[PDB]
Design a protein around this ligand. Sequence first.
Ligand code: HEM
Ligand code: HEM
Ligand SMILES: Nc1ccc2ccc(CCNCc3cccc(F)c3)cc2n1
Ligand SMILES: Nc1ccc2ccc(CCNCc3cccc(F)c3)cc2n1
Ligand SMILES: C[C@H](O)[C@H](O)[C@H]1CNc2nc(N)[nH]c(=O)c2N1
Ligand SMILES: C[C@H](O)[C@H](O)[C@H]1CNc2nc(N)[nH]c(=O)c2N1
Ligand SMILES: [Zn+2]
Lengths: 407, 411
Amino acid sequence: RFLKVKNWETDVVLTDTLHLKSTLETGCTEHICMGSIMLPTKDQLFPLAKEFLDQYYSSIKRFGSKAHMDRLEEVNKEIESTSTYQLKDTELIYGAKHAWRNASRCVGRIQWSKLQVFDARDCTTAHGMFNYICNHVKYATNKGNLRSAITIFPQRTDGKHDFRVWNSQLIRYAGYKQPDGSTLGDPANVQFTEICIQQGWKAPRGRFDVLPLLLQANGNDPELFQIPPELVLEVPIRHPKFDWFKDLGLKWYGLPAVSNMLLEIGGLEFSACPFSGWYMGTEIGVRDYCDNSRYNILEEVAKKMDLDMRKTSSLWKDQALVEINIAVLYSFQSDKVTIVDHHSATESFIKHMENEYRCRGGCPADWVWIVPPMSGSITPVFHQEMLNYRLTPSFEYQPDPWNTHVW
Amino acid sequence: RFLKVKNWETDVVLTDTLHLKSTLETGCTEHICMGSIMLPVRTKDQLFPLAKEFLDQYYSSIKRFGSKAHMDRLEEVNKEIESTSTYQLKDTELIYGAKHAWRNASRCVGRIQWSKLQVFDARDCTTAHGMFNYICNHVKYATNKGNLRSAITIFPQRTDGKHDFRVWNSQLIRYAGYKQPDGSTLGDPANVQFTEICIQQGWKAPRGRFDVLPLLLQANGNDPELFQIPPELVLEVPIRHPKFDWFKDLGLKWYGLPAVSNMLLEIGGLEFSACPFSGWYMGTEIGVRDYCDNSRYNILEEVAKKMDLDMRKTSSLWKDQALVEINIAVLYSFQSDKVTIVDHHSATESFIKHMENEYRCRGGCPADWVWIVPPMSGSITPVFHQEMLNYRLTPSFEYQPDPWNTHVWKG
Ligand code: HEM
Ligand code: HEM
Ligand SMILES: Nc1ccc2ccc(CCNCc3cccc(F)c3)cc2n1
Ligand SMILES: Nc1ccc2ccc(CCNCc3cccc(F)c3)cc2n1
Ligand SMILES: C[C@H](O)[C@H](O)[C@H]1CNc2nc(N)[nH]c(=O)c2N1
Ligand SMILES: C[C@H](O)[C@H](O)[C@H]1CNc2nc(N)[nH]c(=O)c2N1
Ligand SMILES: [Zn+2]
């Protein structure tokens, strides 16, 4: 019931009680661990509201005050009546910050409480959503000095009137299958790129074409909008030592902005809630560039380095991987775009876990995601035992819209 | 109930039915995953069901299930249990058992090799000197002048829990660690405590950076006894780098034979508390963990110094750079000296093929992702992208408490 986690590098032992509040389920049982699986009414709504408001009012040291009981009463009456309810701004901001705070897969959560929340609940049209989004993009980008932000669109009502951003991130590169056989641009987005095209987008058909937004307001057919190029900050990728690196023609965008998730606060569902922070280097250089099903450029870089690609045991892949990642970090830093390396992010997270164990009685963490995709054991999080559990408010996955939408 | 795992690189989806034969528990519940926790005297009562399920599995594997021999064997084991409270395994069931425990080891990336396991039956062993003799033969056989062969030596099983056979060492071959009065460590920091136990039992420590520890061996619940492994039996590899000539001057070497000696082999409810086994190294075990863990030899700084990398910011990735160079060196040295080693690309690719084969023939392959994914270059190996299901099958290898914590000293 009180659980211990050990750091095997430092012997530091933390005790976890926060897990006893865990409300959602994990995927696992006593017989099988599913830790590495990627994805594992009025009646229902009032307990969910209560649990949230109880934690909200405890967080402001007003648990069991007349203010607390009154709001519980007020929300109760509103559920009874409307079959839903509305968050106060204060609750909304709290809800959003806490969803980040509870994101067990996020290494960057030391930052959780500095989150700019843009309340777009008054939004009604796809054009409005586009305006909100461009404002968010410009605010968060801050000419390279990035700030965390979330923009929250109206909450699900009857599931017929959902707001959705069909994009997976606000800024992403197009991917095109070729007669050729292979793939131009980003293979992760081939399907979304076709959905745009089949909705009307004139594709430049390049390697690094910023996708148009596909925005759905109020359950309508989604619409296309080009993010003003002037708002999309990009970084040309060069190496501090290899001059030929530039000639690979690589670039990436400064702003990581996930837009296909669902934010749940007190049982209410916010199906359009694009949020952004800034990149850890490995996300671009390890995953985006080197995944076989992504830009997959390892082979080409190794060649330019004249490495022995005859045997896996020369560690040419590994040698090239490190160089690609040095280059990503160097380019972002050169151009003054905020970026974090995996050593610094993971060091931060250990300090954050320490703070949370101390102030909150724990910190849900998914080791499989927290440990970076390169140099695992030379980062401190490798040696850190973590307990994974699901707390609310939360961000959740949801089915890609085109499978759902009654077109 | 069927369970699916997807590989997110290849889209290959596999179906798991084997997890239905799983008995032991995981640590996890519907409310908490303990997948990153390092560690998550039997009656007749619990013994016969464990023996029965085991012999049912053995008889099935030899296509004799329900045969007269199967039935006569169950009856004979049962009789032996109620009369003696325990039972002896036939040679063949021991072999099958030891192989299955390897096949079932969800944290082992080397399991493609599970069926080629040389089993040495040391159950007639009675004394610590007898144990030393068995272990030398094991080491010499497994080593095979650099052409490493998998092996396990199986000493007598637990009886009343007061007559245990144990190898106190954590691996048969390991280097001493010495905590110095300024607080610095000499040799391998992992083995300090045990080094200290050996000293106290009377080992005369050479006190170098790579002193092979002596064997501390307990027979029949008696106090353990020291022995030195003949040096001619300890194959070692000096570490050098193909392009960096100063690498040799770091004075590094490692031993060739990874031989884990502190686990417990469970087969059909029986407990083999001394069951040392060995394979060969995956390069990252030495190059990443043994050399570059902060808590181990910790050579990253000195290597990056010699490479004259930019060490003033972590964002130069000097650490990642030194790490690759050290690991290139470990593989280069082993291959040059013709001592078996596998790199992490080769091993993980083999594992993916082993796993798919196992899903097809066995209906599953329990696998611990946290452990299978290599401690460097995780996502450029195919395992990273492979969903895995972790569950516990018997026969199995289990942890046990360090014996200095539990032993009743005779004096
Ligand atoms: C400020 C800088 C931030 C850093 C460096 C960062 C770092 C990361 C990284 C590296 C991942 C794993 C990504 C992957 O491999 O796909 C991640 C996951 C995640 N982070 Fe962050 N994060 C940041 C800010 C945010 C913010 C602002 C939110 C929301 C308010 C957020 C919520 C999440 C969620 C929900 C996940 C998991 C998504 C999933 O399960 O697929 N993070 N974080
Ligand atoms: C033949 C070559 C082998 C290779 C390359 C190999 C590879 C590995 C590696 C890399 C690990 C994780 C090591 C660590 O990070 O501490 C491991 C774990 C393990 N392997 Fe092997 N293995 C081999 C043979 C064997 C053999 C012969 C057995 C026993 C019969 C075995 C049973 C295990 C077990 C039980 C574990 C998990 C130990 C734990 O939980 O601490 N493996 N294997
Ligand atoms: N730097 C940041 C900041 C916030 C982030 C939030 C979420 C993610 C994850 C992106 N999700 C895409 C995805 C990844 C893996 C499986 C899947 F289904 C979908 C990365 C972040 N990276
Ligand atoms: N190459 C091989 C072959 C077989 C192996 C069997 C077991 C192990 C694991 C040994 N672990 C030592 C250890 C060190 C630190 C903490 C801990 F729990 C365990 C590695 C193998 N490595
Ligand atoms: C199969 C496995 O769960 C999957 O590849 C995971 C592993 N860890 C990850 N970790 C992070 N941060 N991001 C990911 O996309 C993944 N993918
Ligand atoms: C806390 C964490 O589970 C622990 O560091 C594990 C992680 N994965 C590992 N994986 C392997 N192969 N070996 C290890 O010693 C560890 N250590
Ligand atoms: Zn689990």
